[model samples]
Target: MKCKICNFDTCRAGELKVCASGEKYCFKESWREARGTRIERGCAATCPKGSVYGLYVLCCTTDDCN
Candidate 1:
């Protein structure tokens, strides 16, 4: 799928999630990096100017859930 942010083609299917606000992310990397930690999900909770796209999270297996 096409990334809503940079419009990059790095986005893939099954890696999407909806935020409480309804936004979507291409993947968890973008999601977490965009809303996982205080740096991304804290005071700077807002998505970066150009990074705002779909609200989604990355998917992983139990082995990599940590």
Candidate 2:
């Protein structure tokens, strides 16, 4: 998955956290700080300015299944 904030590509599933609003996705590091600022947590709270929060499930880029 790609972080809307830094646009950093991250495949770390457990590292992702859903915002309280269930609108955006955030990295584990960011989730901690975002949770503190807003009553809700997740992508909704971590999305950068001008960006809307929402879950984005990315598909495999390679043709190799295994």
Candidate 3:
């Protein structure tokens, strides 16, 4: 599947990356930093079940849904 890839430091927003090695889900996770929010988006082998430590996590099966 195809997903959007993101990194706080270097990767450009909305850049596309393909999932490999049987990964079937796209996940978006974000958490509060000291002054701003950090976001991470990529392919996931499995969709996570819950939030942790103030993190907001979500998953989707459609292309670029992360």
Candidate 4:
């Protein structure tokens, strides 16, 4: 998986790399001020977890899906 190290709003693009095992790929995430922010980044960050929001994940990486 290619991991892009971006900014808070991700208006910039950074280096992409082939992530290793146990290393959570990073790109973008969501859920504002009161929760954990690091969403999974592997496979285009398609969230594979449940949420109180919806089936469609409400994260930032999926918002771009690079």
In the order shown, the candidates' Cα RMSDs to the true structure are 13.2, 11.8, 3.7, 7.2
Stretches > 4 Å off in candidate 1? 1-7, 22-44, 50-66
Q: lDDT tens digits, residues 1-66, model 3?
A: 577677655557768877743646777777766777777776766655444556678776765663
Which residue pairs in model 1 clash with each other?
A: 17-56, 23-55, 24-54, 24-55, 24-56, 25-54, 25-55, 25-56, 28-57, 28-58
Cα lDDT tens digits for candidate 4, 21-54 = 3323333444433553433233333445446752
In terms of lDDT, the poorest run of 10 residues in model 4 is: 54-63
Best by TM-score: 3
**Candidate 3 clashes between residue pairs 3 or more apart in a chain or in different chains:** none
Ranking by lDDT: 3, 4, 2, 1
Q: By TM-score, highest first, what's the ranking?
A: 3, 4, 1, 2
Q: lDDT scores for all predictions? A: 0.29, 0.29, 0.67, 0.39
State the lDDT of candidate 1 residue by residue for 1-66, as single tens digits: 222222223323323223333333222333324444211121112334324554443332222221
Question: Each model's TM-score?
Answer: 0.18, 0.16, 0.62, 0.28
Question: Lowest lDDT 10-mer window, candidate 2?
Answer: 57-66
lDDT of 2 by residue, 1-66 (tens): 333222334433433322333333342222223334222223423433322433333221111100
What residue pairs clash in candidate 4, if any at all?
none
